[PDB]
């Protein structure tokens, strides 16, 4: 369990990153 | 007097565990400061001695936290005060020592020497 894992602990999804995920995920 | 016995026991627990790592010393001081504050909130006649010893342990905790800062690991030209913590710590210990010396009625020379 890395304390500084970015991909992990994705409960705190931002606004820009969430939209980026929605845009680059289903493609 | 269970409360007086607990206060003495917590103080000697702080005194007798002064050989730990800085993190453990900070944890012990935080625990004992919390216990002394709550004891002052419970036993009214021991409230003054409780927060007196709590302010002393807060002084020691601030000293320990200031002596374990990241600024000692960098050189003097690379030191930066915009993320400093020890400068506020020394001022806080000064304020707490003055508060300890002058807002407590039952002080004597045998306490004033440790305060100074």
């Amino acid at each position: 369990x890395x304390x500084x894992x970015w991909x992990x602990x994705x409960x705190x999804x931002x606004x820009x990153x969430x939209x980026x995920x929605x845009x680059x995920x289903x493609x | 007097d269970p409360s007086q016995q607990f206060l003495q026991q917590s103080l000697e627990r702080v005194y007798s565990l002064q050989h730990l790592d800085p993190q453990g010393a900070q944890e012990l001081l935080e625990f004992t400061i919390r216990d002394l504050q709550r004891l002052g909130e419970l036993q009214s006649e021991l409230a003054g001695v409780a927060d007196f010893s709590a302010t002393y342990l807060r002084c020691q905790l601030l000293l320990i936290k200031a002596l374990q800062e990241k600024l000692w690991n960098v050189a003097a030209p690379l030191y930066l005060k915009q993320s400093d913590l020890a400068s506020a710590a020394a001022k806080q210990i000064m304020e707490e020592t003055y508060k300890m010396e002058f807002m407590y009625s039952g002080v004597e020379n045998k306490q004033v020497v440790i305060i100074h």
């Binding site: 369990x1 890395x2 500084x4 680059x24 | 269970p2 607990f6 690991n73 050189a75």
Partner: protein, 886 residues
């Protein structure tokens, strides 16, 4: 309007129909949430109390539910006496249900009516009633009033005692009646009497429900009233080792868990010894797992230092380390790891290898099963071995080796956790990264498409540990990774996260290729500009890697190419700035990197302008233009240091890692400024005893290790070349100008705040006073602001004080310099300033909002709101002033 809505739901409670009347009653909490005004909450609560007094019991229950849901708003009614009196009037009802509802009202209102004696008397009288609902409500009201009033508690303690040993009271009502003694945490003698009653009560009623409830209320009393704890712990251990029921032992276990979580420092060595002895001779794994959970909670605290050779705790941890139960094994491994990293005695050298091999056995047991309960023990084991590697460095090689051997023979969902563990270990010990690169790369190769759901997470985690492990660049492995993503994953989010990790760890050519592969995958042009800017930044940092050594011409070429790409990137980055979530930190960080690289290029140009542009015809001084050139370079680098500092102060939402990165850049430009000063400008005045006490170099990242190594090397070179040469020296320019190369050789790391916005907080700062004020009057700035915490409010830092600075600049200087440190109490603050405007004309005033955190660090985060003030003169005062002047 607030009062309009109040009348709108007020007209419904004289409807006569019970449905619209309960409608009207239960709409009240929404009104309280919308309009928290004390003069209006007061009227609403008074008419709620009136309809409580006149309504039926269902309306009274609705009023009770509203009162329970509005407990924080009923402290601001201030007409307490008549409100409580008109509720209390129907304690005299012959209906026991109405009496019960009123007792629940009084218990609900106990926060705002402590020491209210008729309420105490009503609770005491209703405790002896013959109706079960009234007695239960009286118990609830007594539990509430005992928490809020000690004068109620001292008599009700005796009353509850006498009606517990009263055998007319049934057993279930006794069970409901025991936890009143939990709130006896007011006086020491009160808690002592409660403990004596509980001690008689446990042995008097040895029922399992009675002993559960009595032991739990005894421990809540002992935790709240702190002078009860060692005897409570020894009582719990005695009941854990002697009482044969599994439920009693289970409460003793979870209760000692609570007491170890709350006050681990008060545990004596005898208590830990007794708990260990309990864990040795138990035959049940369900109890042993709980006891080891308590001991593992105790192991991570200072109770081990109070406990301390090979003791019963060590033997118990070794025994439970090799157990068929995975939870018991995880707890024993946790105890062993905490003991190992706690101290450095001679006895733990034997059990260090025991901890390592127990960790390896737990890995080989918890990896191939994919159980939901197996992943928790796997996380515990991997966190324990991360702690073992970080706390004690030398044995980390075996930990890394067993992780690498376990990776090739484990299921996919376990591989993400081991990749996280391996990345956490490898960022702290960099020598282990390069030795494990081949096996990890083979593991990346053998993926192909042999997963469908965990494939993405495994790919990003395994690429992350490739990037952390490879301190240098990639030549063929980059192509193999690119081919693996192109064949396997068309999901561009995995590519983006892998490129994000690559730019985090400094592998910028890989990030550049992945960002080129992603420009056609986005929908919004904003993300296209963001990805193009990221591609250009990665390309520029890759162009910076062409610095081989000592070649200042190739240095100028590489810095110029990197600058070209890098502010092409900032050209494409500010196009991605949005009104909602702007790219403020990214723009400032990239602008500061541009300014630092340009200052580096200018300093190398001054290196070349030593030998070129020879000194003037002059018989410091007699050095030519180069003295002023290094003076300007020092000023620029010090300005860069101050700008990195103000970026640090303006971030406030970053990690420790991003703040450390900004501090590293600031220290870099500070190092260059000091290297200019100490050996060009004034070597005599400078070069004091600047010996950095390099003790425990607790650098969290490999990038930080490289930066401090470069800093130490450059500082040692500066100190060794302080006064050995004249200030116009070829060695001075060479050592400084190679310090530039050493600083730029390590690649830049883009941290998490550059990519992910966590702890989004700001100040609304809605001030209330071009406004015009008379010359003789003084303007009053009634400034108020509300903070806006996003998701996690205190993930990294929390606001302690909001320091507001306001100053007035005439002729839209800075004469009304004012400062007030206000404390927000409900995430909202308000303070009022007094500004004087003697000079007539337009006065531009500005207000700042600095935030001081819990540690005392000032963060300049708030908006700089400006309003213009005009100082118009009274016609009578103007005429009087002109008459007096003329």
């Amino acid at each position: 309007d607030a009062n309009s809505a109040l009348m709108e739901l007020d007209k419904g409670l004289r409807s006569g129909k019970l449905g619209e009347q309960c409608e009207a009653v239960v709409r009240f909490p929404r009104l309280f949430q919308k309009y928290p005004f004390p003069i209006l909450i007061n009227s609403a609560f008074l008419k709620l109390a009136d309809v409580f007094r006149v309504g039926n019991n269902f309306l009274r229950l609705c009023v009770l539910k509203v009162t329970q849901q509005s407990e924080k708003h009923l402290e601001k009614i201030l007409n307490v006496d008549e409100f409580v009196k008109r509720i209390f009037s129907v304690i005299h009802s012959n209906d026991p249900v109405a009496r019960a509802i009123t007792l629940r009202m009084l218990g609900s209102l106990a926060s705002i009516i402590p020491e209210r004696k008729n309420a105490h008397h009503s609770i005491r009288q209703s405790l002896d009633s013959h109706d079960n609902v009234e007695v239960e409500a009286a118990v609830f009201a007594a539990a509430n009033f005992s928490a809020q009033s000690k004068d109620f508690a001292v008599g009700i303690c005796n009353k509850i005692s006498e009606m517990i040993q009263g055998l007319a009271t049934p057993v279930d009502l006794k069970l409901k009646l025991i936890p009143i003694l939990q709130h006896m945490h007011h006086d020491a003698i009160l808690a002592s009497s409660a403990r004596q009653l509980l001690q008689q009560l446990v042995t008097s009623y040895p029922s399992t429900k009675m002993v559960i409830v009595s032991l739990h209320t005894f421990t809540l009393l002992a935790a709240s009233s702190l002078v009860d704890t060692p005897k409570q712990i020894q009582l719990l251990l005695q009941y854990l080792k002697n009482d044969p029921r599994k439920a009693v032992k289970r409460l003793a276990i979870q209760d000692l868990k609570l007491l170890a979580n709350k006050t681990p420092h008060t545990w004596s060595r005898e208590n830990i010894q007794a708990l260990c002895e309990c864990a040795l001779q138990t035959p049940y794994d369900s109890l042993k797992l709980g006891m080891l959970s308590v001991l593992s909670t105790l192991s991570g605290t200072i109770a081990i230092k109070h406990y301390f050779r090979s003791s019963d705790l060590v033997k118990l941890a070794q025994e439970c380390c090799y157990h068929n139960n995975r939870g018991i094994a995880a707890h024993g491994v946790r105890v062993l790891t905490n003991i190992t990293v706690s101290c450095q005695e001679k006895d733990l050298l034997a059990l260090e290898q025991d901890a390592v091999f127990g960790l390896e056995s737990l890995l080989v047991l918890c990896s191939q099963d994919d159980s939901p309960g197996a992943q928790a023990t796997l996380k515990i084991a991997l966190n324990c071995m991360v702690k073992l590697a970080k706390g004690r460095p030398h044995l980390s090689q075996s930990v890394v080796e067993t992780l690498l051997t376990q990776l090739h023979s484990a299921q996919d969902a376990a591989r993400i956790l081991m990749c996280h563990c391996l990345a956490a270990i490898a960022m702290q010990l960099p020598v282990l990264g390069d030795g494990m690169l081949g096996d990890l790369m083979e593991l990346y190769k053998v993926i192909g498409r042999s997963a469908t759901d965990k494939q993405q997470e495994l790919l990003v985690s395994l690429a992350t540990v490739i990037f952390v492990a490879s301190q240098k660049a990639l030549s063929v492995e980059s192509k193999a990774v690119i081919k693996q993503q192109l064949e396997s994953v068309s999901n561009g989010w995995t590519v983006y996260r892998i490129a994000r990790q690559a730019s985090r760890m400094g592998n910028h050519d890989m990030a550049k290729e992945l960002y080129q592969s992603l420009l056609t995958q986005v929908a919004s042009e904003h993300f296209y500009f963001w990805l193009n800017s990221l591609k250009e930044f990665s390309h520029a940092e890759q162009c910076l890697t062409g610095l081989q050594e000592e070649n200042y011409s190739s240095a100028l070429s590489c810095i110029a190419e990197s600058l070209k790409f890098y502010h092409k990137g900032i050209a494409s980055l500010t196009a991605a700035s949005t009104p909602l979530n702007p790219l403020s930190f990214q723009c400032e960080f990239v602008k500061l990197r541009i300014d630092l690289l340009q200052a580096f290029s200018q300093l190398i140009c001054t290196c070349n302008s030593l030998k070129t542009s020879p000194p003037p015809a002059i018989a410091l001084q007699r050095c030519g233009r180069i003295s002023n050139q290094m003076k300007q370079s020092m000023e620029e680098f010090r300005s860069l240091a101050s700008r990195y500092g103000d970026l640090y102060q303006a971030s406030f939402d970053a990690d420790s890692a991003t703040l450390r990165n900004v501090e590293l850049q600031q220290q870099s430009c500070l190092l260059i400024s000091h290297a200019i000063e100490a050996l060009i400008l004034d070597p005599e005045s400078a070069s004091f005893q600047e010996y950095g006490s390099t003790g425990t170099a607790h650098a969290d990242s490999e990038y930080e290790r490289r930066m401090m190594s470069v800093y130490n090397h450059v500082l040692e070179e500066v100190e060794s070349l302080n006064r050995k040469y004249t200030p116009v020296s070829y060695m001075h320019t060479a050592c400084l100008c190679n310090a530039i190369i050493a600083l730029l050789k390590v690649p830049l790391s883009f941290q998490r705040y550059f990519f992910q916005k966590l702890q989004s907080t700001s100040i609304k700062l809605a001030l209330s006073p071009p406004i015009a004020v008379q010359n003789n009057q003084q303007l009053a700035l009634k400034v108020e602001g509300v903070v806006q915490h996003g998701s996690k409010p205190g993930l990294f830092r929390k606001i302690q004080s909001v320091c507001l600075n306001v100053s007035s600049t005439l002729q839209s200087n800075m004469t009304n310099e004012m400062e007030q440190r206000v404390e927000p109490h409900n995430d909202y603050f308000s303070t009022q300033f007094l500004l004087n405007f003697a000079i007539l004309g337009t006065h531009n005033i500005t207000v700042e909002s600095s935030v001081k955190d819990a540690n005392g660090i000032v963060w300049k985060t708030g908006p700089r709101t400006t309003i213009f003030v005009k100082s118009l003169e009274d016609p009578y005062s103007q005429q009087i002033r002109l008459q007096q002047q003329q």
